[PDB]
Symmetry: C3
Subunit: 148 residues, 3 copies
């Protein structure tokens, strides 16, 4: 069971879109992509990881308002209506002086092993205000899971 997705920001849907048919993406052993969510085949331990790369416009009107870079993986269940934070990484953005603006680049990576159930659905959750700022080029942004 292994799966690696590449992702990008979409114009129509205001979301980060994962794909299993582009670049170095692949699906194997039951792990599969269904509506920007990874479906777990069986109960067991899986390693889950994600990266999101950003080019931030920054600038004073956007940084007097405080906005952090947050990248999380959310489980999904039919056994629960809401969502639960499997894990998340959070960083302060625009670590420099405002008027002098210039593009600021940063990447968040996290990975961990979890005790997941058959039928669990995993999706990502990145700061909505920074979504128009995600890169794709070559595996700059990805999502993947493998059975341990």
């Amino acid at each position: 069971a292994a799966i690696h997705l590449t992702g990008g920001y979409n114009s129509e849907s205001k979301t980060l879109d994962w794909r299993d048919d582009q670049d170095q993406a692949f699906s194997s052993g039951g792990l599969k992509l269904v509506n920007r969510e990874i479906i777990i085949p069986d109960d067991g331990i899986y390693f889950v990881y994600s990266q999101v790369s950003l080019h931030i416009s920054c600038t004073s009107e956007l940084t007097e308002e405080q906005v952090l870079m947050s990248h999380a993986v959310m489980r999904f269940s039919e056994s629960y209506g809401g969502k639960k934070p499997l894990f998340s990484a959070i960083r302060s953005i625009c670590t420099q002086e405002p008027e002098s603006e210039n593009l600021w680049y940063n990447t968040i990576y996290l990975g961990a092993a979890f005790h997941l159930r058959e039928g669990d659905r995993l999706g990502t959750d990145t700061t909505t205000a920074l979504l128009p700022m995600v890169e794709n080029d070559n595996g700059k942004t990805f999502f993947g899971v493998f059975g341990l």
Copy 2:
């Protein structure tokens, strides 16, 4: 054979206290937590990972004297003397303006495969001055090992 620990700052012992009994923590197949160290069950190859999440005050007075974000995994073995760094990561903290306020957030994540021996002990080594500021809200700070 896999272990996932969550950690928080312990105001009493003044240590990053890894636990296997909170959040998404689990121990399986022989890997276990004994006095802040992961004990290795058998000889073999293991993937080791750790994330530390910090919210730094930063100040002006806690600054100037250059303090760095450093997180490492140390290996203790019956095959040698004291401890050796399996790996470590380091970052410059507080890169925002001195007198200006706001809490600074930064996460550090490391993960690699290593050849280990039965009875081996893994522990973490994080910048002591920044320990009070570790953030253990739902596994933002974790330590885990799994056998390959």
Copy 3:
């Protein structure tokens, strides 16, 4: 089948050199180092990871140049054209004010699962300007692959 390499800045040659015989480095099951490339034994899914650590003087010249930290893993395959980015991570460097110094420290870590073929070769690609400042001590800079 796993391999972990440590890396350092050659001074004689201006390159990031991977070593399979220093610190916690090891080779197992057919994964081997030939030049600065990891040779893949058989077809299959492999987890790939790499971390690079830098301490930069910083200055003003190379601040207004707006140079950024970039770390990528490239794949060489007969099944493809030239080299292709399995993944990459970019980061804004020196985010402090220039005239006052201290050295600026940062790290970039990447890891993901990929389907690779027998005879495939993996190498790294780091910002060539920053190569003089890669840390070679402990396990700050490394490259590794393991079969899933």
